[PDB]
Ligand binder design. Structure first.
Ligand SMILES: CCCCCCCCCCCCCCCCCC(=O)OC[C@H](COP(=O)(O)OCCN)OC(=O)CCCCCCCCCCCCCCCCC
Ligand SMILES: CCCCCCCCCCCCO[C@H]1O[C@H](CO)[C@@H](O[C@H]2O[C@@H](CO)[C@H](O)[C@H](O)[C@@H]2O)[C@H](O)[C@H]1O
Ligand SMILES: CCCCCCCCCCCCO[C@H]1O[C@H](CO)[C@@H](O[C@H]2O[C@@H](CO)[C@H](O)[C@H](O)[C@@H]2O)[C@H](O)[C@H]1O
Lengths: 93, 179
């Protein structure tokens, strides 16, 4: 039972890599913003893990509560065309 | 001096130039305009890999060779290395006078770079600020940045050589009647 919660920092690192890849990869930028929100949740988790839950809640109420809201606010109101992630366009990188 | 290991340094040279050419080819592939893929990094690169590798091998090989032939460490070795590197960069243009000009001019440029110390930086213990300066005090040997009111005549005669006016004894005292 003791070490069931040992690798909860490594899991957050893994999930952060995943959410960044999904940000880069998502077709609609609304989905990229949602994955940025998930990355903020993961960071807030990690901050609770290392003993800074005050910063976790500050992040939840500032980043997710205002900045992500404003991102959604602008993409709901502005035409932001997008090229989908492609192999004929991005494989050169 | 201490001899240079030519082939080892030149092998390191070639690997470094190869890595740099790969990095430049990737940068060109990503910065370019037309349709491109992971195929074109070596197909459409303008000889960047060969530029880097040839320049690196030529410079280091020629530098260490001239240092081992001349048995010295000085800026003329950088002159020769620049001559060789310019010859490589000028053989690309398939013309004789451009090749000669590239060789001669980059030889002169890298030789100036070596003449000045072979460094874009400073030595910082040979600079004027950190070195003993001003007038030298009591018969001491004048260093590079020091100043002297009156110099030794043996030193003059050795540095310059006898003849053409400059003699180990003044003329008037040397021709003074022993009276
Ligand atoms: C992979 C294995 C690795 C192995 C380990 C060892 C590897 C060593 C790697 C060394 C670094 C190599 C980097 C190569 C340069 C970057 C690639 C490049 O192309 O730079 C120029 C870049 C694009 O240029 P491009 O799009 O191709 O079009 C050119 C048309 N004019 O456009 C740019 O503006 C980017 C410029 C980057 C420049 C960096 C700073 C260079 C400093 C210049 C030195 C000048 C000093 C000489 C002074 C002499 C004075 C006369
Ligand atoms: C575009 C036209 C170009 C023409 C102009 C040419 C001017 C170039 C400056 C030439 C003078 C440079 O002066 C040069 O002198 C001394 C020798 O006297 C060199 O000698 C010094 O070299 C360095 C590098 O090893 C070390 O400190 C070494 O111990 C030595 O003391 C210096 O590296 C350099 O400073
Ligand atoms: C176009 C003209 C203007 C060119 C611009 C550059 C001007 C300045 C000339 C470069 C000065 C180089 O000077 C540098 O090299 C001389 C040797 O020659 C060194 O002088 C030192 O040489 C060592 C030998 O290595 C001896 O012990 C010597 O007694 C002295 O201490 C100093 O480390 C430094 O003073």
């Amino acid at each position: 039972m003791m070490y069931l919660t040992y690798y909860f920092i490594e899991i957050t690192i893994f999930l952060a890599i995943l959410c960044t890849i999904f940000i880069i990869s998502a077709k609609n930028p609304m989905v990229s913003i949602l994955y940025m929100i998930a990355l903020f949740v993961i960071a807030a988790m990690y901050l609770y893990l290392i003993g800074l839950g005050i910063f976790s809640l500050l992040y939840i109420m500032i980043y997710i509560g205002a900045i992500a809201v404003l991102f959604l606010f602008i993409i709901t109101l502005l035409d932001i065309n997008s090229t989908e992630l492609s192999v004929k366009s991005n494989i050169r990188d | 001096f201490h001899p240079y290991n030519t082939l080892g340094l030149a092998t390191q040279s070639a690997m470094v130039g190869l890595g740099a050419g790969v990095v430049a080819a990737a940068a060109r592939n990503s910065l370019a305009t037309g349709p491109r893929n992971i195929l074109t990094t070596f197909s459409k690169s303008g000889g960047v890999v060969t530029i880097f590798t040839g320049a690196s091998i030529a410079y280091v090989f020629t530098y260490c060779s001239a240092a081992n032939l001349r048995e010295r460490k000085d800026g003329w070795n950088h002159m020769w290395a620049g001559a060789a590197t310019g010859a490589v960069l000028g053989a690309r243009t398939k013309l004789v006078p451009a090749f000669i000009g590239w060789t001669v001019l980059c030889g002169a440029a890298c030789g100036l770079f070596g003449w000045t110390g072979a460094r874009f930086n400073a030595d910082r213990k040979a600079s004027l600020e950190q070195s003993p300066k001003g007038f030298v005090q009591e018969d001491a040997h004048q260093t590079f940045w020091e100043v002297v009111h009156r110099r030794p005549l043996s030193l003059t005669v050795e540095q310059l050589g006898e003849g053409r006016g400059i003699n180990a004894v003044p003329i008037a005292t040397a021709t003074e009647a022993p009276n």
